[PDB]
Design a protein around this ligand. Sequence first.
Ligand code: ATP
Ligand code: ATP
Ligand code: ADP
Ligand code: MG
Ligand code: MG
Ligand code: MG
Lengths: 101, 248, 239, 51, 398, 401, 171
Amino acid sequence: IDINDVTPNCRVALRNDSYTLHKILPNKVDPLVSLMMVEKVPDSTYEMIGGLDKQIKEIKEVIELPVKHPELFEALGIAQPKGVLLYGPPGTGKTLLARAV
Amino acid sequence: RYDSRTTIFSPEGRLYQVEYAMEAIGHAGTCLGILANDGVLLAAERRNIHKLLDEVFFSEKIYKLNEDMACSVAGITSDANVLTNELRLIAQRYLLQYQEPIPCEQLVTALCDIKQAYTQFGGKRPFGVSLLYIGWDKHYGFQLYQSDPSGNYGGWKATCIGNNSAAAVSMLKQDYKEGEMTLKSALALAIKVLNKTMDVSKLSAEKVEIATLTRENGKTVIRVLKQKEVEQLIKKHEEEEAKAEREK
Amino acid sequence: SYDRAITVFSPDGHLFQVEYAQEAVKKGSTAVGVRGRDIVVLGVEKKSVAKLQDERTVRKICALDDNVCMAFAGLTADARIVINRARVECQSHRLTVEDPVTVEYITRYIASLKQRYTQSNGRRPFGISALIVGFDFDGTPRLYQTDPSGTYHAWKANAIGRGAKSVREFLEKNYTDEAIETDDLTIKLVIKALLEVVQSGGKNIELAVMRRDQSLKILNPEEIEKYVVEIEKEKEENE
Amino acid sequence: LRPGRIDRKIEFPPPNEEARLDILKIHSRKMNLTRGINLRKIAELMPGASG
Amino acid sequence: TKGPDAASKLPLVTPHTQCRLKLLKLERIKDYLLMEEEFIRNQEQMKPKQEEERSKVDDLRGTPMSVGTLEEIIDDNHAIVSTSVGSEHYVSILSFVDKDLLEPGCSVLLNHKVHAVIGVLMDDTDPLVTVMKVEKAPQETYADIGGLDNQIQEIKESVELPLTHPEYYEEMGIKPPKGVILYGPPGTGKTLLAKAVANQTSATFLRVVGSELIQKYLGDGPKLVRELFRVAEEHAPSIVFIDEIDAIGTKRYDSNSGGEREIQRTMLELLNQLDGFDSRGDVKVIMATNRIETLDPALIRPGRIDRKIEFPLPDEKTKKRIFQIHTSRMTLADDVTLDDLIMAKDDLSGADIKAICTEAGLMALRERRMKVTNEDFKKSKENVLYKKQEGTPEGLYL
Amino acid sequence: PIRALDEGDIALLKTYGQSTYSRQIKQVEDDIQQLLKKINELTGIKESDTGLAPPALWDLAADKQTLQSEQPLQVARCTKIINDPKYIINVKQFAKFVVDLSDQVAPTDIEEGMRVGVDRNKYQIHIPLPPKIDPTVTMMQVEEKPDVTYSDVGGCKEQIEKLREVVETPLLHPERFVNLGIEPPKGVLLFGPPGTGKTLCARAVANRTDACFIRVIGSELVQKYVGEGARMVRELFEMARTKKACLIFFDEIDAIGGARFDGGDNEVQRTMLELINQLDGFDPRGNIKVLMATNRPDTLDPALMRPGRLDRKIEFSLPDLEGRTHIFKIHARSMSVERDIRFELLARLCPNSTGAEIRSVCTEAGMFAIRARRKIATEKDFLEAVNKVIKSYTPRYMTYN
Amino acid sequence: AKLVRDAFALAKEKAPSIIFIDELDAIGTKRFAGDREVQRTMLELLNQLDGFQPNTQVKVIAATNRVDILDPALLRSGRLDRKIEFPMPNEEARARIMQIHSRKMNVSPDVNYEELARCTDDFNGAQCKAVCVEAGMIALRRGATELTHEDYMEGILEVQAKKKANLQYYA
Ligand SMILES: Nc1ncnc2c1ncn2[C@@H]1O[C@H](COP(=O)(O)OP(=O)(O)OP(=O)(O)O)[C@@H](O)[C@H]1O
Ligand SMILES: Nc1ncnc2c1ncn2[C@@H]1O[C@H](COP(=O)(O)OP(=O)(O)OP(=O)(O)O)[C@@H](O)[C@H]1O
Ligand SMILES: Nc1ncnc2c1ncn2[C@@H]1O[C@H](COP(=O)(O)OP(=O)(O)O)[C@@H](O)[C@H]1O
Ligand SMILES: [Mg+2]
Ligand SMILES: [Mg+2]
Ligand SMILES: [Mg+2]
């Protein structure tokens, strides 16, 4: 293990006898924040969302285009949009679109 | 907060109670009036359409104030009744002192002054009644006036107050031909506006009330359309909608 | 916690309700008034009334007497009542004393009514600041401003309503004896002062012009158009 | 809700007539519909469905 | 002493536009970078005494070496060191430890077996504090702010000018303002002016959120604040930026809750460090709040926050400057007359005068155009200005 | 009708445009970032300083001799002595042991309650140790007089006189109080608007305290572990008692002295209850004059504010006109101001402003004089500073006159 | 719990002993991880109280400024039951307090302690002693060898931080 790979707060493992580092180990993540990472993708798909073509395109302009092709924004000279907010009457399809994304 | 009483001024200088009343005026049923070259008309929506309710007056929202005036209502029932009674009293008092009909704007200003006095003196809640005025006078002829809970009136060619007042007013602005509307065209436009101003489809005749002001041989007859002519107008609008969709 | 009653003094001796009422005057259409040797002008901005409403009932410049006119700001409901009471007071003063009501007297009565309304609870202060201008002095032009509080002041040229600070700054740096030496130049000064506050075309400025021993003359849009054309010509000359 | 933390606020109005028909088709794909099951009439019977 | 640990930053490239002059500048910077890399790579390789002393010291020290707290100094070769588990040990002080630094409360380094003191831990800074230190300076400089001139001048006189030209203040006899509060509507340029100051400043810059100063444990909050200010003082010229101050600076009020009383205690520790017994030293505090009416009067009183810089919503000239700044990179078309959108009613902020730019770019992308047009800007404004619902009165006033 | 982008459209957008230099510049930027990271990793050390003395200072090969010969000794306190005598020793938190002395020490040396060292294997007592002197409590002392004297505090003649009568006069001249049978108040609670100058008076007292001055850090008294804050308060008051005529300053007493409520603060409340009985109750406190300050006196527990613990309650009101003028002169003594500056007008233009606001106005006037390259700040600069500092933070003034 | 048990055992060993648990609120807070240890300390005390053989030779006296915060179980029947109530001193109480705490000082025989008691409504014993001490200190300020009634009134003013001035409307 090189000293350059041990960044602060890296959760190393130390040998019991001499306490020498022999591994880097995955970084510690608070137990409760781990459950917020979507490991199993939901079943909702875009074709299941109807009547929201404009909304789907608008959301993909921020969730897909900036990350898929950042060079377009770099050339255009505009900052990549960061966040998108969904609001409307209850049961209109916001969570469905979130699952589809 | 600064809405404990009407007399209290907000730091920005807003009568919070008056604004609250003017916002609450939106709960009232939709009413509108289109000024036409030959007269002016009013349209109202009967929110209560229960089968067990007997229609005895036929003018729940449209009242006759003078021989040449009439004013629709929108707002609290008790406040509306008090305001209409005061309007009749003011008009008849003016007739008695001057022996000629009130020139409309005088009655509007008197009612607005009463409402302003209520919104100023402490211990009185603002009149949450916004009522449209129509009438003809020797000075300016046909006029339509809007009264708000704050006493701020204003001349208007076509306005709607109550439910979805914004949409009705906007699409009246979109399709109102200044100085080229006849009473028949005015009624057609009023029915068209009322059709989508209310969620109820088919614009049932029993659910809409229309009154028209006309100048016939110097009499100023106020006529409340009977159900037959209202149904005829609704059928005409339905046929016009079918013709328009024919293009599709 | 001292801003919920008119008759309650703050620890620093402020009648906070009156100060809040002045904020209402701060929210109205600008009014500019400048008095000349033989002319008194009351500038006003129109608010581009709705497409489908009549502007005859939105009169903001009204004459209390045959030779005294006032332009107000603030809420119209209170301004109308103040105007009506001022008219009744002028007709009563004429009745008791045949001499026509002086501009000073009408301004004093308006201030007295406002003060009486801002002196006890259960009576909200009048949220309109009135610029009363008139040749009622029988050969002398006078202009006054009645604050919503109740104090009046004699002003050669003052501004009320939205943009009052900018219009006052313009008037201070441009109102000189050479400026108002003639009626036309006084009207041009009024138009120029109101132009910085109201950036728009014609019909957005209503000018009430009163000459000595005359009646109010609400200038038609064409005349304001002619004066704006003249001012544009002057600006072109400067460049 | 500042235009730097939230850039795009997409509204989600209750589906209109065609939107309601599309939603009905989406959720009726696995259903065993019968001839004469016109969905336009059903959608017309839902004036303001939440979706 | 421990002079400033100023953030590192590469020089700035002026062309911006992808001209060959920018290519030459970047090539020169890369050449010097490769220069340094080659020099330092050859040094150790090209390299072929103190080794004996180092070996002896490390063999006496042994590994691992425990880090403990020195409780007292009994003799010149004996001290009481309390291990991390709270147990006190009467260990022997070895010769190779400067007795000058050995003071009560310091973190001593001990042998694992005999526990004999072998060294004194100097930094021992709380890891939650060493993170705050700004190492990579943000790229947003002063030229990246449209207008906010008066504000820039005030912030410079408070945090920037005093270091560069202290002569003026020394001769005038006035101690330069050592505290500035940035308050105003959201999206006005508060955090920006902070980023620009951090970029230009040569003093150590510490960033906090006003929510990381609060710790779950009872005494961790005040101690974290004390550690942060001690670290700032260690690097003499320092600027501490507490954004979102209104998180912990809320008006003190009788709270029947340890949470609230703990937050109030954190605020009290902050205001005691800022201006209380003992001078604050040469540490300048910059705070941002979109709500200054809710801050404790003590925290924002003169002496702690000496310049309450106001950040208003941009005016016409400022708005035109923020359109020029955020459209410079963009390839605008010939018909883009920004004045139309610049007019506005009263309520266009930088965030919008930038989201508007981003939305115009995206709408240009929709039509497959990399050069924006006036229609794109109007549509972007209409789409991105939908923030406030009413915020206005009715047609009452005339 | 908006149409999504395809692969060909993306390729043409990223190619149909500027491509003669864009690719080179982008690659140069990416590789420059990579080179910076490589350099940082290559150095990536910043060797942390350790307490290693100069080479000649230690130069000791007998350090290993002392390490191998000497043995670490756990520190413990002998709760009881048994009668060969046996000793009960509490090893802080480890456990309770019944050990006997090693031959090195004599039985007479070890007394009950004395903290003594013990070997890690048998727990035998080997050497006595001086009684614990807490490091935080000891660092809580001043031992460095701040450079603010009473001449720097203006507009508070009565308040300063009362403070001296409480904390200084009884210590310097006990006779004036003993002769007339007057017990001087042992505590003062400086409560007033923030920025009025309570801490300045405290610093002045510490400057001319000529006794033990202890500044109580509110952070240390509030400790993570239960019962640690009360222990710290009890150690501080013991360290005050061991000295003669000590002075304790409980700065920002509202930090811990909140009103008790029914877990809430709980632990801080326990520490407050410990200070309360220390200040007043059984076991008279002694010659320890307590100085407390707070800008919010209404949140203090009534027990802490009762005139038995805070005997004299000095109110630091906003300075009057004379006080403001004196403050202006005090803060403008060093400023290079002109000779015609009417400090009376500047005092009258700050109606309700503390000394801190006066200092802010003085600094603002100096900064204004520095803006335009002038080395003398004229009265106009002070007027502008007053407008910026007080007035900044017409129609309303129209009514007044 | 160990400390409380040891204290009670020491009280037992000495035959005529009394235990004074002052500031009982610290450990007597109503039942709600320091809470656990404090609840355990309380249980120990409630037990050492019930462990007493009735009318034993050890009596426990406790003090508190807040009975509401006190745990109801502490009072009960076999535990501390004699809730001796201490009221804010009455007129006679305040006068007597002033007399007791003004004994050591040179006091003018012209002092009307009854008037002072009337003038110090809502004053506890500690505040009354503070009033006496402040009157003495103020008398020292003027260099007066002997206290005066006006000095006592000024001390009463100073005890609550109040300042009296010649108002321009109270003539
Ligand atoms: N005056 C301005 N000039 C240039 N860019 C600006 C300006 N105001 C805002 N921006 C841009 O918009 C962003 C948002 O502004 P900033 O981060 O300063 O917000 P803020 O005032 O801190 O608001 P908040 O209260 O949300 O933290 C900036 O990072 C910058 O990119
Ligand atoms: N009365 C005064 N005379 C002179 N300078 C003063 C006075 N009051 C405050 N200052 C100046 O302001 C500085 C800070 O004021 P200080 O810390 O004493 O206020 P405070 O009332 O103790 O604050 P807080 O109540 O918030 O704890 C002082 O160091 C001094 O320079
Ligand atoms: N436009 C739509 N297309 C397809 N399904 C929809 C649409 N609107 C609503 N739904 C259905 O309604 C349900 C609402 O779920 P959810 O997305 O959680 O609603 P909301 O976003 O209001 O919380 C979903 O299961 C979804 O299948
Ligand atoms: Mg949902
Ligand atoms: Mg920010
Ligand atoms: Mg202080």
